[PDB]
């Protein structure tokens, strides 16, 4: 039907159909009168994966021959989501498969709903790695993503009685047709033991866990390129001994549900080394099949989680390859680069020295050696600056001596980058200021991006098409060509069509909620905040605005208000008490608002259950207003924001992370910017933040806190939200009250624009047209030329 | 090359090569450039697997609405699946040609496949032969069991000692299983019994999911493909909660390596209820797709007492869930269930402590006591005033620990009870189940064990199969009684030559196997083979006494000629069993002296065959000259290894125990090396000292064992063997020693007469027909299940 999804030729369609029935017969062992809806998905899944094989083999054989420099994106997280539709898109098979399945009497989009999400990530950091994998393939880069095959991904969230309930994400339950086990490359990973020193060093008496690789294809956009994601699963090398094999194998069991937080879990450390040791061993093998090592190898560290790659490569070159220290260290630093994702201090990985001593004795030794030579450098550039040394040291002082993994990374990386312009500048000026003064050349910016395949062509084919009608399809892998749409801001047809595709998407998401769960008003402003639940994200600020909306209606029931459906989605860390309370608050607001006869259709507040990649694909194309309301200086970049912008939502936001650059690309008159700037946060910090001042001064704010505290939103348990109130009044690091007045005033302005369909749509066009910079193709190109030292090719 | 393996039709060969390359490419993602032998096995496995699916779908659709037979077993000792599949679909020759043209040795590919070693020994191997026979006899038969992640331990010999390694048989994936997610079921554990307005309900339980995997069971050239359904366990701070999922999933992780023993392990009971609860749920769903007709549509065969919980579980579903009255439900249950016993050894009997059942299965314990009361009321009615009889028949045993006897349970709830060999089925009626036979004589039957002539002849001994078919055709494969036509060829010069030719060929193949995988044996020696699980009752120790006697006799008379022997002993010991582990090390310790004495050289060799399993049996058994089957009379219920040796052309030295009796009967006692005490004779003792003093040769050997002749660095190592043989031998080894050695002299005397050795072998092979599992299954079908076997073909 839709030209962007390619051709459905007669002979090509008949092939798909024969191979569909073939797979149902031989692969799934079924007839047409016994086959389950899952069986049909799998037959199509296999039908599509057959088309990947040839190119995959050829792609990797092409790299062997050209022998380009190899990019290894090292990450504990790959938030991949579904694979079927994405594969069909990248290979231009979508229409021909849709027709094939229709002819056979099946709804392909219903079949697509059976695939489990590869939810191997927590949030932004993890989905960035997934977007990167897409872009690196589309740009022809010799790139491999290296990670862990968690048996269980991010927990599946159930909302029970208004509360978050965690259940296991058993994604591999029915099989993974999109992975290929490669047991020929099973490798030993070592733990514990001790270190002998001889006339070199020798790591002896270790416990072994095998690492078994599973390869998953990464198709580039219509370029016949198929790269690889390699994920390692833990494998053990009378009766109790056999069951005790579980302990070693628990290393790859489950993804740690920690978004932006650190705890020194020993199992976490084992995971990070597991991935590091196996990957690096695999990298060296491929290299041999070391002066030229950094000419042929780039290792990108996605946060400090794989920071162990620094001493581990030092361990291999020195202890096993018998290289001199200084030479191994030149090679190591030229190889590794580090991407920082957050300035929040509780997220910073600082491992107890004791824990590293027992588990990785040799690595501890090397860390201490790296630290001495590095501080000898700091002492030489800044002689007598004693306090600089203790600040820049990898070893932290205390009743628990710790290793600062970030400091390890900066010392062992030739490139250190932030994720948005403002965040990268924050690193030079504050958190890494000492490091910036020592080696300013190391410090870069690489503003995040999102893939316009999954986040436009895949999730919003209707928008992709109306754009295609005007400028062709070249934009899909050259997103800057969206600026051509500026010439259409006064086009009556395009204005009609943009509005039309939005309503259509809003209708589809409304059907999804009805079918799977709730009735939402299709004729209301879709107000959406989806992301992880954190204080810094300030879902709680959204909450105060929603209650403001509610109280304003109660104060003047007859007064028209632009009807809104307020949607908030996101998972809370299972151990995050405040985040769990925040989810409970949102549902409890909904309990009162959604049932008050006076309100009715004017205001609905719903918590979107189990926010994940496949849900993002559904809800973001249906959003009108994108909530991006972090307190300035807290959100390093954001990527959810870029998705909303590309899918036709207007943004209400602070001047934080990539919101700054989004406002710059679209012009600040097409953006609903509000609140404190970073400077204003410092002004409050230096003077001391008193939220009681705001309380005593703002009557509407006063009303809500008394509602919260007295029990208006928890009648059966009036005590319920006391921790939220006490925090907001006396321990708010995130100054929710300081931005309340500007937020509510700025939301009034949003409602004013919505009352005017035409000027809402024209502002929408101005956003879509200038989202081009926020393609991950742009991001990867900068990484490649500025850090990796390779040239992309489409 | 050979006729018995079918046609290598040019068109099949072309399509076989095409699908091989296709699978290598699409399924395996490989080129001939980076493909290993393992890739090549899997490419073939998939190619052959494809030929099963059409038949498999059409078979299960065909199931006419016949009565369905459900063989329930904790063990299915299947072995490998590639060759067996090709034989039954008549594709062996076509695939040998296909891989040849592709530059590959098909037999080298077959060696990659791991055994499905989901069994300990005979019991589990029996289930496997039974599935094959039931498919070949066209019965709507399902095998139900557990998918152990780790089968029977892989055995390595280190320092002459048994090492145990985990049988990670699933490591590279199993092409021969098909997961069936739509049929995942909840199995419940622990919880409590509460009482509602309408009956009892089992609530507040812990749930473990049961995930079914189906394996195709092809019939020999009849287009029938049945199913073995094997259940895998699946779970329904946060991190620890996810990790703790391992606990439920541990239920299906490992096969208990107990063979002749009962361990009251709680994890074992969980395994038993796991398979039973899921199976019965499955059975009832297919029945629904009135319970008076349940027995005419369902037969549940209980392989030993391991699945005995099926009795209270069927009662539970019928009463608590389906709401039938107790009496009617009980009628359905007894008419549906039948019990097979496999041993009389007291330590093997399952006797679960009442305390354990109460906690894990509180509702089943209630139902057990209710069954017991109604059963004992019955006993009291038939034999009024026999109080002792009541305590002896009760499902509940008194003592410091109250226990439920599962065998008493099975008989009470079964309409048929059978032993596995004529002699054993009789001793059941006369001793261990004497009282139950007196109450219900109609229930007690015999079903002599069998082995499949496909796997145990056409597959493992194709050369033998071929020379046989050259005389009588291929009809014998699924009609083994036709082997009696070979009796006519007993004076035939060509057949005598051919039988000898194929045996020497098999001996050369095994001698190459040993040199390749583990290195030397002399191919021109008598192959004296004892392979089976290691245990006192089996008497590997009697073999050791003969071996040492043979060694001492050559050292006393060095110039005297002796018929050269290669004595091979193979088998696994139970990892707890200290005495069985000592036996294995004693066998290697002997070997260590005898194999390095320059005066002996190639004249006598003693070797321990490492890692005996189904795939190894298929190698050594075709090569054996002498089958050792030397169990103390009364202890081996039937045996099955004995039958394999007979069909493959080995002579048998054995006691009149188990199926040895019927083997000798079929062939004629002239054609068998019978020795030692019969059952009657054993019942006249249970003093080994009497033998030691009267027999000077026996004396010398026991002086060598204790004084440290076979263990120099460890002088007292075998003190426990000496002490047990002298004082605590339950299996009177010393009592049969004398007859054993003399009978072994008559083995050697015949061997030095090659024509007469071979003629007797002919008489053995030709009368092995009865010991086909097709004969066993026909009987089960007719005499227990009430179904008619058919060798009728299905279309296409
Ligand atoms: O080497 C194998 C052989 N093998 C496959 O490669 C396996 N193939 C794939 O999983 C696979 C194939 C393709 C093509 C892709 Cl494109 S992604 C992908 N994955 C099929 C299979 C089935 C049963 C047993 C083994 C296999 N397996 C190791 C598994 O632990
Ligand atoms: O390559 C595959 C394809 N595959 C099957 O083999 C496929 N079917 C079988 O395992 C299978 C097929 C047949 C035919 C038989 Cl006859 S026995 C048997 N088993 C089911 C499946 C489901 C989900 C993902 C992949 C598969 N799997 C390797 C495991 O990742
Ligand atoms: C993009 C994405 C995130 C990150 O969104 P932010 O608003 O930038 O925090 C988190 N979760 C999912 C499922 C995503 O797709
Ligand atoms: C048949 C067989 C057995 C049973 O042999 P017996 O001598 O009757 O105990 C045990 N293990 C394997 C592998 C077999 O094939």
From Swiss-Prot, chain A:
Pfam family, one: Phosphorylase
Phosphoserine modified-residue sites: 3, 393, 477, 709-710
Positions contributing to AMP binding: 31, 64
Regulation: Allosterically regulated through the non-covalent binding of metabolites, being activated by AMP and inhibited by ATP, ADP, and glucose-6-phosphate. The activity is also controlled by post-translational modifications including phosphorylation.
Classification via InterPro entries: Glycg_phsphrylas, Glyco_trans_35, Pyridoxal_P_attach_site
Molecular function as annotated in GO: glycogen phosphorylase activity; nucleotide binding; pyridoxal phosphate binding
EC number(s) stated in the UniProt entry for this protein: 2.4.1.1
Catalysed conversion reaction: [(1->4)-alpha-D-glucosyl](n) + phosphate = [(1->4)-alpha-D-glucosyl](n-1) + alpha-D-glucose 1-phosphate
Signal sequence segment: none
PTM: Phosphorylation of Ser-3 converts phosphorylase B (unphosphorylated) to phosphorylase A.
Site, Can be labeled by an AMP analog: residue positions: 144
Homology family: Belongs to the glycogen phosphorylase family.
Record protein name field: Glycogen phosphorylase, muscle form
Source organism (scientific name): Oryctolagus cuniculus
Gene, per the UniProt record: PYGM
């Amino acid at each position: 039907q839709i030209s962007v999804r390619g051709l459905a030729g007669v002979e090509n369609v008949t092939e798909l159909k024969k191979n569909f029935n073939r797979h149902l017969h031989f692969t799934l062992v079924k007839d047409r009168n016994v086959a389950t809806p899952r069986d049909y998905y799998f037959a199509l899944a296999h039908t599509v994966r057959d088309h990947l094989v040839g190119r995959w083999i050829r792609t990797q054989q092409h790299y062997y021959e050209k022998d380009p420099k190899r990019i290894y994106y090292l990450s504990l997280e790959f938030y991949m989501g579904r694979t079927l539709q994405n594969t069909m898109v990248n290979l231009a098979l979508e229409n021909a498969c849709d027709e094939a399945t229709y002819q056979l009497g099946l709804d392909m989009e219903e079949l697509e709903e059976i695939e489990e999400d590869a939810g191997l990530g927590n949030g932004g950091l993890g989905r960035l790695a997934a977007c990167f994998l897409d872009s690196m393939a589309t740009l022809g880069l010799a790139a491999y993503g290296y990670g862990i095959r968690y048996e269980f991904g991010i927990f599946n969230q159930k909302i029970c009685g208004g509360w978050q309930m965690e259940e296991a994400d058993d994604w591999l339950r029915y099989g993974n047709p999109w992975e290929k086990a490669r047991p020929e490359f099973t490798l030993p990973v070592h733990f514990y033991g001790r270190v002998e020193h001889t006339s070199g060093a020798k790591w002896v008496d270790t416990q072994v866990v095998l690492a078994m690789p599973y390869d998953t294809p990464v198709p580039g956009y219509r370029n016949n390129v198929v790269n690889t994601m390699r994920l390692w699963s833990a494998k053990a090398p009378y009766i109790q001994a056999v069951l005790d094999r579980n302990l070693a194998e628990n290393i790859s069991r489950v993804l740690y549900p920690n978004d932006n937080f650190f705890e020194g879990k020993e199992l976490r450390l084992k995971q990070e080394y597991f991935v590091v040791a196996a990957t690096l061993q695999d990298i060296i093998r491929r290299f041999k099949s070391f002066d030229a090592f950094p000419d042929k190898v780039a290792i990108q560290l996605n946060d400090t989680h794989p920071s162990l790659a620094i001493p581990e490569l030092m361990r291999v070159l020195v202890d096993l390859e018998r290289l001199d220290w200084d030479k191994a260290w030149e090679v190591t630093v030229k190889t590794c680069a580090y991407t920082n994702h957050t300035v929040i201090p509780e997220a910073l990985e600082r491992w107890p020295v004791h824990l590293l001593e027992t588990l990785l004795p040799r690595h501890l030794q090397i860390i201490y050696e790296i630290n001495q030579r590095f501080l000898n450098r700091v002492a030489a550039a800044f002689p007598g600056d004693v306090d600089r040394l203790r600040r820049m040291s990898l070893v932290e002082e205390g009743a628990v001596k710790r290793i600062n993994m970030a400091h390890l990374c900066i010392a062992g990386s030739h490139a250190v980058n932030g994720v948005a312009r403002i965040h990268s500048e924050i690193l030079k000026k504050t958190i890494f200021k000492d490091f910036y003064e020592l080696e300013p050349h190391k410090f870069q910016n690489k503003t995040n991006g999102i893939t316009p395949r999954r986040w436009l062509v895949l999730c919003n084919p209707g928008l992709a098409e109306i754009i295609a009608e005007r400028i062709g399809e070249e934009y899909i892998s050259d997103l800057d060509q969206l600026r051509k749409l500026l010439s259409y801001v006064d086009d009556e047809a395009f204005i009609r069509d943009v509005a039309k595709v939005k309503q259509e998407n809003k209708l589809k998401f409304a059907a999804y909620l009805e079918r799977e769960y709730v009735h939402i008003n299709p004729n209301s402003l879709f107000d959406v905040q989806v992301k992880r639940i954190h204080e810094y994200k300030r879902q709680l600020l959204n909450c105060l605005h929603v209650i403001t909306l509610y109280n304003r209606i109660k104060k003047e029931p007859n007064k028209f208000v632009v009807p809104r459906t307020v949607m908030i989605g996101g998972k809370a860390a299972p151990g995050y008490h405040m985040a769990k309370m925040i989810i409970k608050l949102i549902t409890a607001i909904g309990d009162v608002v959604n049932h008050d006869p006076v309100v009715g259709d004017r205001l609905r507040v719903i918590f979107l259950e189990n926010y994940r990649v496949s849900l993002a694909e559904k809800v973001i194309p249906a959003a009108d207003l994108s909530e991006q309301i972090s307190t300035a200086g807290t959100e390093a970049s954001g990527t959810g924001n870029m998705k909303f912008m590309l899918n036709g939502a207007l943004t209400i936001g602070t001047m934080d992370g990539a919101n700054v650059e989004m406002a710059e690309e679209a012009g600040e008159e097409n953006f609903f910017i509000f609140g404190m700037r970073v400077e204003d946060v410092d002004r409050l910090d230096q003077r001391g933040y008193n939220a009681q001042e705001y309380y005593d001064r703002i009557p509407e704010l006063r009303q809500i806190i008394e509602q919260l505290s007295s029990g208006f939103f928890s009648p059966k348990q009036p005590d319920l939200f006391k921790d939220i109130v006490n925090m907001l009044m006396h321990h708010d690091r995130f100054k929710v009250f300081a931005d309340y007045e500007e937020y509510v005033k700025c939301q009034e302005r949003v409602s004013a624009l919505y009352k005017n369909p035409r000027e809402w749509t024209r502002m929408v066009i101005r956003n879509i047209a200038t989202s081009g910079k926020f393609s991950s193709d742009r991001t990867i190109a900068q990484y490649a030329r500025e850090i990796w030292g390779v040239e992309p090719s489409r």
